[PDB]
């Protein structure tokens, strides 16, 4: 009834969505051979949001999976979840992008969007009523930031009514993995503000913290940092997919949170995190969840929230609950630390309630928030850029593939005037 | 009992190391297999 | 050197794993000290070919006898793809 | 379907390609016959009876080392026409290399390249292996970068070339032909890696304890840097590289494209089990000046762009906690136009040892293909030697007598004027 079209690009994306598409297989009781073997009946109610129907009771997703090289979607088919993802929905190229923007935005990822847009416009008109979009993609790479920003650009040109959301993998500001991060991440956030409404910035430096000091694992992979990112994705739509006390959809937190066309850069979170060995000493109640997600060490981008004032703060909940006790907890976190909000909005907190907790939990919550201390996620990239523009550090790659320097010069006049709006209110 | 004594000893009984756990580990869930089929609305 | 290091696969009677560090001279010799010399030299089959060319009743032979002998009885072609003749082919058996 | 055709040329290229194409036999299930008893398709092609035949071109003008490949058991794997043989050499000269003898075996190479790339559906670049200081690789390769940059055009090209040794040198006329092959490579290439012959004799004496090593004791060591550079197409892993990931993350400028190689874990068989190979020490090996494969100190100059191609147990966490202390120290210097600096690539396969090798079975290998402005010192000692014998016009008469003039002498010095002018202006801070 309100389906979700999912987009993927890069190899950074397609390890995350491969982990996103298994908690949906967990919560809807989907086995890795396409059928359904869950013991409930409410899990089969709104199955249609992520599972198109076929013969034999098979449920296969609304998934788009794209890269410019064949070397990544070989492994996605070769994962634990091979039979579920659609064979016609592996759009592939031949040459890797190789950490460059115009390799995907103007030349090699640009010739291939006419086969992706064939897949989407056929699929998105098979939905009876789509709610909108979502993307998990690399700003760090050459395919997600190069090709995928065209798909944010060109699909929004088709339907301007729906909602664009982004599980952005923004680079860390401290330790960098590529010498052209202040170009591919600088130029990508030039087109995000005219085009995209929800922007969830994710850092791996912020997430190497959490799987050590909170989950207590000495040997973390990506696949156990991908699951917390894959926790918060299905942790957003908890109320559209299930009944409960107060349902909310993805237009209901894009109205409560973003008072302006250009102040819409969120800050993600997840509530109930405790060690694997010490799981049964805590009491999983209402004061335990709220005391964690209102802190800096439970935050999925690498900026300290204490250096600014939140404009607006969202939430969502799940599980059987007593709504007055949350209502006592939301005023306390508006009455005690009143210096960590601006004074020119009356109400800053929203809540919404599901009914069925996840398989193995009892009380769940997910933290989504606008904050004006996300400037330090962008000023570090914006000060890395002009320390190499002035030395013209890599411009021969970019000029020799169909760009200018006037497409470079205006991509920090956007990035400066973005921060030149957030600065006044904090 | 070196650094990180208790948890690394405890987790093995409940649960090529990187190659086996490359897909992940069951971090954010209980050890019990099923808590579905709750007709609890 | 090609034949010793590559094709030969190296020395055989020497120490396969052990490299023992000796007393007086300060050295890990028992791999380096051998400088392998095992077995026969590099033979690869050229004296054979030139020997059949070197050493030799067909002096009196017409080429039609030598170049056209009787072939063996088993090298004859099997006709796998041929229209079967058990059912007689379409032929104008009306003689008109 | 992501193949790579790689070019070895010269007396070195058959000496290296005997010891470079021996891992690709060994780490797949590939016999030196050619049989197997699908990651191999980047270097091995199916035939209708199971036989795998490679996709590389090995050229030398003198047939005196190519026929050694034809003698041993490396013959049925290779293809009979895929190895090009002349009758005479070029004899340490660039005039014989580039004009006379280079003009008749050049149209037998390009039959096979044009048949190789017309069966490669996923070729991404070229990889070159030539000698600066010989007769063939100085000249026959110099014709090819003139000739392949007009046919196939805008494709990537990289070379791991054998730089002249700094203090010792073997053949005397080399500070002519080393300078003379340089005006023909700075505008017809993209990434010029250098290795040295003397600078690995130091490595096998201080890390390994083997005194008096052979070329084939130095051919397998450089032959494992190659298998850590193709280590992204070849296997699976977290973050993967390709031939356009290399120079887009390594070369900044049009005319400064000279990086430097370093391979981390070098140790014997017996001493490995008495020592702990943590990821801290493996990334703290390539930042010592006693591990570089040229004889230069990075303490004089300034780094500009680095790389890291891990294998095996990368565990990205403790790698990230190991680069984070390299960024701390003031001994390691950088230039302010590159505040990011690094690259990380990952592969899952730990490296493989050959039978009768000199390294052990290591589970974590690091190559570090970085550029520095301290190669500009190393060019000068190879450029000081030029006018020390042009002033007397010492060996010049071998050059006019095979087509060249003395104007190629007059400008190849002047090209080194503005190349080393450029490195002083990139090494200055803002």
mmCIF file of N, CA and C in Angstrom, chain D residues 25-94:
data_model
loop_
_atom_site.group_PDB
_atom_site.id
_atom_site.type_symbol
_atom_site.label_atom_id
_atom_site.label_comp_id
_atom_site.label_asym_id
_atom_site.label_seq_id
_atom_site.Cartn_x
_atom_site.Cartn_y
_atom_site.Cartn_z
ATOM 1 N N UNK D 25 51.306 -19.547 -12.158
ATOM 2 C CA UNK D 25 51.228 -20.994 -12.236
ATOM 3 C C UNK D 25 50.885 -21.579 -10.876
ATOM 4 N N UNK D 26 51.545 -21.092 -9.832
ATOM 5 C CA UNK D 26 51.569 -21.813 -8.569
ATOM 6 C C UNK D 26 50.344 -21.547 -7.712
ATOM 7 N N UNK D 27 49.807 -20.332 -7.729
ATOM 8 C CA UNK D 27 48.722 -20.018 -6.816
ATOM 9 C C UNK D 27 47.336 -20.341 -7.355
ATOM 10 N N UNK D 28 47.167 -20.479 -8.661
ATOM 11 C CA UNK D 28 46.008 -21.202 -9.156
ATOM 12 C C UNK D 28 46.383 -22.680 -9.230
ATOM 13 N N UNK D 29 45.503 -23.509 -9.774
ATOM 14 C CA UNK D 29 45.821 -24.918 -9.893
ATOM 15 C C UNK D 29 46.503 -25.251 -11.201
ATOM 16 N N UNK D 30 47.441 -24.402 -11.619
ATOM 17 C CA UNK D 30 47.969 -24.399 -12.977
ATOM 18 C C UNK D 30 49.288 -25.151 -12.993
ATOM 19 N N UNK D 31 49.330 -26.261 -13.718
ATOM 20 C CA UNK D 31 50.585 -26.954 -13.910
ATOM 21 C C UNK D 31 51.466 -26.145 -14.855
ATOM 22 N N UNK D 32 52.790 -26.312 -14.781
ATOM 23 C CA UNK D 32 53.650 -25.749 -15.832
ATOM 24 C C UNK D 32 53.509 -26.439 -17.184
ATOM 25 N N UNK D 33 52.740 -27.527 -17.277
ATOM 26 C CA UNK D 33 52.241 -28.006 -18.560
ATOM 27 C C UNK D 33 51.247 -27.027 -19.176
ATOM 28 N N UNK D 34 50.237 -26.618 -18.412
ATOM 29 C CA UNK D 34 49.181 -25.760 -18.919
ATOM 30 C C UNK D 34 47.802 -26.214 -18.482
ATOM 31 N N UNK D 35 47.736 -27.398 -17.888
ATOM 32 C CA UNK D 35 46.507 -28.057 -17.477
ATOM 33 C C UNK D 35 46.102 -27.610 -16.066
ATOM 34 N N UNK D 36 44.850 -27.895 -15.706
ATOM 35 C CA UNK D 36 44.375 -27.823 -14.326
ATOM 36 C C UNK D 36 43.773 -29.177 -13.973
ATOM 37 N N UNK D 37 44.179 -29.806 -12.861
ATOM 38 C CA UNK D 37 43.611 -31.097 -12.454
ATOM 39 C C UNK D 37 42.289 -30.940 -11.713
ATOM 40 N N UNK D 38 36.612 -18.797 -10.554
ATOM 41 C CA UNK D 38 37.247 -18.624 -11.850
ATOM 42 C C UNK D 38 37.978 -17.299 -11.883
ATOM 43 N N UNK D 39 38.874 -17.117 -10.916
ATOM 44 C CA UNK D 39 39.699 -15.919 -10.811
ATOM 45 C C UNK D 39 40.910 -15.952 -11.724
ATOM 46 N N UNK D 40 41.151 -17.077 -12.394
ATOM 47 C CA UNK D 40 42.308 -17.261 -13.257
ATOM 48 C C UNK D 40 42.157 -16.580 -14.602
ATOM 49 N N UNK D 41 40.954 -16.122 -14.951
ATOM 50 C CA UNK D 41 40.705 -15.641 -16.303
ATOM 51 C C UNK D 41 41.344 -14.301 -16.581
ATOM 52 N N UNK D 42 41.848 -13.610 -15.567
ATOM 53 C CA UNK D 42 42.627 -12.415 -15.835
ATOM 54 C C UNK D 42 44.004 -12.737 -16.399
ATOM 55 N N UNK D 43 44.464 -13.987 -16.285
ATOM 56 C CA UNK D 43 45.768 -14.381 -16.801
ATOM 57 C C UNK D 43 45.781 -15.712 -17.525
ATOM 58 N N UNK D 44 44.657 -16.393 -17.651
ATOM 59 C CA UNK D 44 44.648 -17.708 -18.260
ATOM 60 C C UNK D 44 43.357 -17.858 -19.036
ATOM 61 N N UNK D 45 43.444 -18.416 -20.235
ATOM 62 C CA UNK D 45 42.304 -18.470 -21.135
ATOM 63 C C UNK D 45 42.000 -19.913 -21.492
ATOM 64 N N UNK D 46 40.723 -20.261 -21.431
ATOM 65 C CA UNK D 46 40.279 -21.618 -21.706
ATOM 66 C C UNK D 46 40.458 -21.935 -23.181
ATOM 67 N N UNK D 47 40.827 -23.173 -23.468
ATOM 68 C CA UNK D 47 40.850 -23.720 -24.813
ATOM 69 C C UNK D 47 39.878 -24.902 -24.780
ATOM 70 N N UNK D 48 39.539 -25.473 -25.930
ATOM 71 C CA UNK D 48 38.547 -26.527 -25.986
ATOM 72 C C UNK D 48 38.933 -27.886 -25.425
ATOM 73 N N UNK D 49 40.134 -28.013 -24.853
ATOM 74 C CA UNK D 49 40.562 -29.245 -24.193
ATOM 75 C C UNK D 49 41.253 -28.938 -22.870
ATOM 76 N N UNK D 50 40.730 -27.968 -22.123
ATOM 77 C CA UNK D 50 41.191 -27.694 -20.778
ATOM 78 C C UNK D 50 42.476 -26.906 -20.660
ATOM 79 N N UNK D 51 43.158 -26.631 -21.765
ATOM 80 C CA UNK D 51 44.477 -26.019 -21.718
ATOM 81 C C UNK D 51 44.375 -24.520 -21.472
ATOM 82 N N UNK D 52 45.194 -24.014 -20.553
ATOM 83 C CA UNK D 52 45.267 -22.590 -20.250
ATOM 84 C C UNK D 52 46.502 -21.986 -20.899
ATOM 85 N N UNK D 53 46.308 -20.922 -21.671
ATOM 86 C CA UNK D 53 47.435 -20.237 -22.292
ATOM 87 C C UNK D 53 47.439 -18.780 -21.833
ATOM 88 N N UNK D 54 48.590 -18.224 -21.467
ATOM 89 C CA UNK D 54 48.634 -16.873 -20.889
ATOM 90 C C UNK D 54 48.389 -15.765 -21.911
ATOM 91 N N UNK D 55 48.551 -14.522 -21.447
ATOM 92 C CA UNK D 55 48.259 -13.343 -22.255
ATOM 93 C C UNK D 55 49.316 -12.252 -22.110
ATOM 94 N N UNK D 56 50.590 -12.619 -22.079
ATOM 95 C CA UNK D 56 51.660 -11.641 -21.949
ATOM 96 C C UNK D 56 52.624 -11.751 -23.119
ATOM 97 N N UNK D 57 53.307 -10.648 -23.406
ATOM 98 C CA UNK D 57 54.263 -10.566 -24.502
ATOM 99 C C UNK D 57 55.649 -10.363 -23.908
ATOM 100 N N UNK D 58 56.589 -11.236 -24.267
ATOM 101 C CA UNK D 58 57.973 -11.155 -23.814
ATOM 102 C C UNK D 58 58.848 -10.946 -25.036
ATOM 103 N N UNK D 59 59.565 -9.829 -25.082
ATOM 104 C CA UNK D 59 60.399 -9.483 -26.228
ATOM 105 C C UNK D 59 61.836 -9.287 -25.758
ATOM 106 N N UNK D 60 62.777 -9.902 -26.472
ATOM 107 C CA UNK D 60 64.192 -9.555 -26.420
ATOM 108 C C UNK D 60 64.723 -9.676 -27.838
ATOM 109 N N UNK D 61 65.664 -8.805 -28.183
ATOM 110 C CA UNK D 61 66.234 -8.832 -29.523
ATOM 111 C C UNK D 61 67.260 -9.941 -29.704
ATOM 112 N N UNK D 62 68.126 -10.113 -28.776
ATOM 113 C CA UNK D 62 68.980 -11.289 -28.820
ATOM 114 C C UNK D 62 68.187 -12.514 -28.370
ATOM 115 N N UNK D 63 68.248 -13.621 -29.102
ATOM 116 C CA UNK D 63 67.434 -14.788 -28.744
ATOM 117 C C UNK D 63 68.068 -15.657 -27.671
ATOM 118 N N UNK D 64 69.050 -15.117 -26.950
ATOM 119 C CA UNK D 64 69.945 -15.938 -26.161
ATOM 120 C C UNK D 64 69.369 -16.229 -24.771
ATOM 121 N N UNK D 65 68.311 -15.531 -24.358
ATOM 122 C CA UNK D 65 67.688 -15.841 -23.074
ATOM 123 C C UNK D 65 66.248 -16.295 -23.310
ATOM 124 N N UNK D 66 65.665 -15.924 -24.455
ATOM 125 C CA UNK D 66 64.305 -16.372 -24.755
ATOM 126 C C UNK D 66 64.314 -17.860 -25.045
ATOM 127 N N UNK D 67 65.389 -18.357 -25.652
ATOM 128 C CA UNK D 67 65.446 -19.774 -25.957
ATOM 129 C C UNK D 67 65.669 -20.594 -24.694
ATOM 130 N N UNK D 68 66.021 -19.956 -23.576
ATOM 131 C CA UNK D 68 66.036 -20.697 -22.324
ATOM 132 C C UNK D 68 64.629 -21.011 -21.824
ATOM 133 N N UNK D 69 63.641 -20.155 -22.113
ATOM 134 C CA UNK D 69 62.243 -20.489 -21.824
ATOM 135 C C UNK D 69 61.787 -21.650 -22.692
ATOM 136 N N UNK D 70 62.283 -21.711 -23.914
ATOM 137 C CA UNK D 70 61.915 -22.767 -24.832
ATOM 138 C C UNK D 70 62.586 -24.089 -24.510
ATOM 139 N N UNK D 71 63.602 -24.096 -23.656
ATOM 140 C CA UNK D 71 64.255 -25.356 -23.340
ATOM 141 C C UNK D 71 63.517 -26.127 -22.254
ATOM 142 N N UNK D 72 63.161 -25.463 -21.157
ATOM 143 C CA UNK D 72 62.670 -26.132 -19.968
ATOM 144 C C UNK D 72 61.232 -26.596 -20.064
ATOM 145 N N UNK D 73 60.604 -26.712 -18.898
ATOM 146 C CA UNK D 73 59.219 -27.150 -18.801
ATOM 147 C C UNK D 73 58.239 -25.991 -18.820
ATOM 148 N N UNK D 74 58.714 -24.782 -19.092
ATOM 149 C CA UNK D 74 57.826 -23.652 -19.293
ATOM 150 C C UNK D 74 57.539 -23.410 -20.764
ATOM 151 N N UNK D 75 57.427 -24.467 -21.569
ATOM 152 C CA UNK D 75 57.203 -24.301 -23.002
ATOM 153 C C UNK D 75 55.770 -24.581 -23.444
ATOM 154 N N UNK D 76 55.131 -25.654 -22.967
ATOM 155 C CA UNK D 76 53.790 -25.981 -23.440
ATOM 156 C C UNK D 76 52.728 -25.061 -22.864
ATOM 157 N N UNK D 77 53.004 -24.448 -21.719
ATOM 158 C CA UNK D 77 52.124 -23.421 -21.185
ATOM 159 C C UNK D 77 52.119 -22.185 -22.079
ATOM 160 N N UNK D 78 53.300 -21.688 -22.442
ATOM 161 C CA UNK D 78 53.428 -20.519 -23.297
ATOM 162 C C UNK D 78 53.027 -20.855 -24.727
ATOM 163 N N UNK D 79 52.760 -19.810 -25.513
ATOM 164 C CA UNK D 79 52.314 -19.935 -26.901
ATOM 165 C C UNK D 79 53.472 -19.670 -27.861
ATOM 166 N N UNK D 80 53.593 -20.492 -28.922
ATOM 167 C CA UNK D 80 54.803 -20.460 -29.768
ATOM 168 C C UNK D 80 55.094 -19.129 -30.432
ATOM 169 N N UNK D 81 54.073 -18.400 -30.851
ATOM 170 C CA UNK D 81 54.270 -17.133 -31.526
ATOM 171 C C UNK D 81 54.256 -15.970 -30.550
ATOM 172 N N UNK D 82 53.770 -16.185 -29.331
ATOM 173 C CA UNK D 82 53.620 -15.135 -28.328
ATOM 174 C C UNK D 82 54.970 -14.656 -27.752
ATOM 175 N N UNK D 83 56.090 -15.271 -28.132
ATOM 176 C CA UNK D 83 57.416 -14.869 -27.682
ATOM 177 C C UNK D 83 58.250 -14.503 -28.906
ATOM 178 N N UNK D 84 58.630 -13.235 -29.015
ATOM 179 C CA UNK D 84 59.225 -12.681 -30.228
ATOM 180 C C UNK D 84 60.742 -12.687 -30.104
ATOM 181 N N UNK D 85 61.422 -13.262 -31.104
ATOM 182 C CA UNK D 85 62.873 -13.457 -31.099
ATOM 183 C C UNK D 85 63.518 -12.867 -32.340
ATOM 184 N N UNK D 86 64.548 -12.053 -32.149
ATOM 185 C CA UNK D 86 65.384 -11.576 -33.236
ATOM 186 C C UNK D 86 66.634 -12.418 -33.410
ATOM 187 N N UNK D 87 67.683 -11.805 -33.974
ATOM 188 C CA UNK D 87 68.972 -12.477 -34.140
ATOM 189 C C UNK D 87 70.145 -11.750 -33.514
ATOM 190 N N UNK D 88 70.059 -10.448 -33.281
ATOM 191 C CA UNK D 88 71.173 -9.687 -32.740
ATOM 192 C C UNK D 88 70.671 -8.797 -31.614
ATOM 193 N N UNK D 89 71.597 -8.175 -30.895
ATOM 194 C CA UNK D 89 71.213 -7.332 -29.776
ATOM 195 C C UNK D 89 71.259 -5.860 -30.167
ATOM 196 N N UNK D 90 71.050 -4.982 -29.192
ATOM 197 C CA UNK D 90 71.223 -3.555 -29.395
ATOM 198 C C UNK D 90 72.435 -2.995 -28.666
ATOM 199 N N UNK D 91 73.047 -3.778 -27.767
ATOM 200 C CA UNK D 91 74.442 -3.621 -27.338
ATOM 201 C C UNK D 91 74.707 -2.319 -26.588
ATOM 202 N N UNK D 92 73.835 -1.990 -25.630
ATOM 203 C CA UNK D 92 73.931 -0.797 -24.777
ATOM 204 C C UNK D 92 74.001 0.495 -25.601
ATOM 205 N N UNK D 93 72.977 0.697 -26.422
ATOM 206 C CA UNK D 93 72.845 1.927 -27.185
ATOM 207 C C UNK D 93 71.368 2.182 -27.440
ATOM 208 N N UNK D 94 71.025 3.465 -27.526
ATOM 209 C CA UNK D 94 69.657 3.867 -27.794
ATOM 210 C C UNK D 94 69.391 4.043 -29.278
#
